[PDB]
Every structure is written in C-alpha cells, then in structure tokens.
C-alpha cells in the first residue's frame, strides 16, 4: 500500500516518528505486512480547502485490494485521527482518495505484482 | 472536488489571489459549493513536456460526479485559460487528468461521502 | 504519457540529462510520439518504504492506452533500471502505479483527446 499526505502544515510541525507511526497503523488497518507499506508526507504546500488556508490535507491511499465501503470508513477514522492528533488538522479539512489497484497495474522490482 | 496543478513556473510568478480564483471558478464550473473545493498549486517543479523545459503544467481534477465528455472539454477550456492568463503557460503544454470518484472512495471527516 | 517520480534521493544526486533520458525511453517503450510525453521528478521527499528511509521511489505512469500486463512489466523493467542506474535506488524499493486513462478524461490544449 502507498499513502501520501500533502499539507500546508509546516515541516517543523511534523513530529519525529510520524512516518513510522503511519507505516505501523496502515499495516494493521490494511492487514498487509509493514515491509509492503510506503508512506510519503509533503509539508509546506500552497493549498486551500473550502476557500481558506487553515491547516488541511489532501491524501491518497492506493492498495491492491482491501478497499471498499466499510474498510474505507475505517481507514478515514484512523487517518483523520492521526492527522488531527499529530498535525493538528481538523478532520473536516481532510480529503482522502482511495484507489483499489489491480496487481498487474502496480510495478515493483523490475516487474509487476501480477 | 480537488484540483492540483504541478508546474515548473517559479513561485514568485504565481499571483496572489490564484488559489481563491481557482476555488471560485471551480465552484461555478462544477456546480459544487466553494466549501467543498480544494486547490493545491506546486511551483518550481523539475518537469518537461515533449522533452522541453519551457513552462508546462501537469494537473488533476478529482470530483464525485460532474465528470464526463462535454464537462471535461468545458473544464479544460476554463483551466487552460486560467493557466495561460495567470501563469503564462501555453495550453498545449498542459495535461489535466479528470477522475470521477465514487463517494465510498473519498474519505472526509472521519468517514467517507457514501 | 505522464510519468512522475517522487523520491527521498537528494536533488544533487539527480544527474543532468535525466528528464531527457526519461522522455526518450518512455517514447520508445510506449510507442507514443515524444511530443506527448511529460515527465516530472520530485527529489528530497519525506518518505519511507517498508518503514525504512533508505533510497526509495513512489511513481505513476498515466497513459491513454498502452497499459496492460505485459506492457507494464516491460515499463517496470525499464524504469526500475533507470532509477537504479541513475538514482541508485534498489528496484525492490520502487512502486509504480499504472493508469489507463480514457481519452475523454484527459485535458490538453483547451479540450480533451476524445
């Protein structure tokens, strides 16, 4: 799985340990081993949410399966909770796009996961 | 909706007011309230279009509905017009990927839009 | 085609000529005319792969057609090979999301490709 967060929160406000925490929590939520989880945080962005520039985040989660109605609600609670606790971003200023990838459409290690 | 533009134009060349303009114009175009429009501009990027480093942009528009053949043509005229007028990017050096998202695949506010 | 690479490799480790090499090799691999190939490299990122901050890359290739099981395996060998040779990134620390775009969902030059 791959999780990306783009945010206007400044780099110095991203706490130590954040990428590991994301990795761990996503391994647990998706059921996939942590060795397969990739995470990416992009602070200091020029962004607005609903016409204002208070802290916000635009995110994506791509996974080979483990995407669906109930699962996505659970991921959103988890991820908004982490962004609120750690980055002080209000959950109503977070969007997360979920993408169920086919294995043949994910490249890795000179081939695909097919 | 979420609109992202990645460009090699320098940050100083992005007008004050640009995020607000995008917000307002996208609210009008999509028919969605401005409160739900998110915009993100990323200048100073290392990119090429057709092998050239002249000004260019790579963009995306994700929306729950309001995506289709005629709508996307209209969005493209609007958004290339704004990039031309405000960032001085030729329309033939812009790509915009349009994505019709299912509500169950968009997280927001500790849940999804489903 | 649009190819994006996000990496924790520093900017100074991205060799001169890399965008041009990507453009050329993607035009050949995809069959597409070089004029339609866009490339974007984003160094210095805060990212982890498998919990580890060793060099890694998170990438995407969007194309109107030319996406499929065998094609994507071929792209992955090409692109992981270039990332290994030029950026010193292990192929097993690269993910590439492949996306087959509908022509009606790609904006360019004030319109779409449909």
Curated annotation (Swiss-Prot), chains A, B, C:
Miscellaneous comment as given in the Swiss-Prot or TrEMBL entry: Serum levels of MIF are elevated in patients with severe sepsis or septic shock. High levels of MIF are correlated with low survival. Drugs that inhibit tautomerase activity protect against death due to sepsis.
Cellular localisation: Secreted; Cytoplasm
Primary role: Pro-inflammatory cytokine involved in the innate immune response to bacterial pathogens. The expression of MIF at sites of inflammation suggests a role as mediator in regulating the function of macrophages in host defense. Counteracts the anti-inflammatory activity of glucocorticoids. Has phenylpyruvate tautomerase and dopachrome tautomerase activity (in vitro), but the physiological substrate is not known. It is not clear whether the tautomerase activity has any physiological relevance, and whether it is important for cytokine activity.
Main location (coarse class): secreted
Binding positions for substrate per the UniProt entry: 32, 64, 97
Reactions accelerated catalytically: 3-phenylpyruvate = enol-phenylpyruvate; L-dopachrome = 5,6-dihydroxyindole-2-carboxylate
Disulfide feature: none
UniProt protein name: Macrophage migration inhibitory factor
Annotated family: Belongs to the MIF family.
Active site feature: 1
GO biological process, one term: positive regulation of prostaglandin secretion involved in immune response
């Amino acid at each position: 799985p791959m999780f990306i967060v783009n945010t206007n929160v400044p780099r110095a406000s991203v706490p130590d340990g954040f990428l590991s925490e994301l990795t761990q929590q996503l391994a647990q939520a998706t059921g996939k081993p942590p060795q397969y989880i990739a995470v990416h945080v992009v602070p200091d962005q020029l962004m607005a949410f609903g016409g204002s520039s208070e802290p916000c985040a635009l995110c994506s989660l791509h996974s080979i399966g483990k995407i669906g109605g109930a699962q996505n609600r659970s991921y959103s609670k988890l991820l908004c909770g982490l962004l609120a606790e750690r980055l002080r971003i209000s959950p109503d200023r977070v969007y997360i796009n979920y993408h169920d990838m086919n294995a043949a459409n994910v490249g890795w290690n000179n081939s695909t996961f097919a």
